[PDB]
Task: structure prediction
Amino acid sequence: MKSTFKSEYPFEKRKAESERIADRFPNRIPVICEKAEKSDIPEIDKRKYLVPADLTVGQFVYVIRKRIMLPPEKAIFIFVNDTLPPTAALMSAIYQEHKDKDGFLYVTYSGENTFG
Result:
């Protein structure tokens, strides 16, 4: 599968969990990454990333690397909308134009530097 939040749970519920994260930390950016099948990296436990609006993709690329705790010899890359944003890009500017109708964000990481 790819996502069970929309399948397993309703679309509102999701937007709900955010409604609170917004009332609690409206200065954050709950990015919802999704394992990239294409890649061959080891799956994660869950997909959740609460970063500030002052952090850049760079950091994120690292955060994820934590969830997968990849080796220092490997190199993972983040992708959005079947794209590959820079590390300088701000998670606020990106999510700003990458934001979904549900609010959350949809990104995917892959051990390879390819969009698929």
Summary: The longest helix spans residues 11-24. The chain has one domain: 1-116. The longest strand covers residues 28-33.
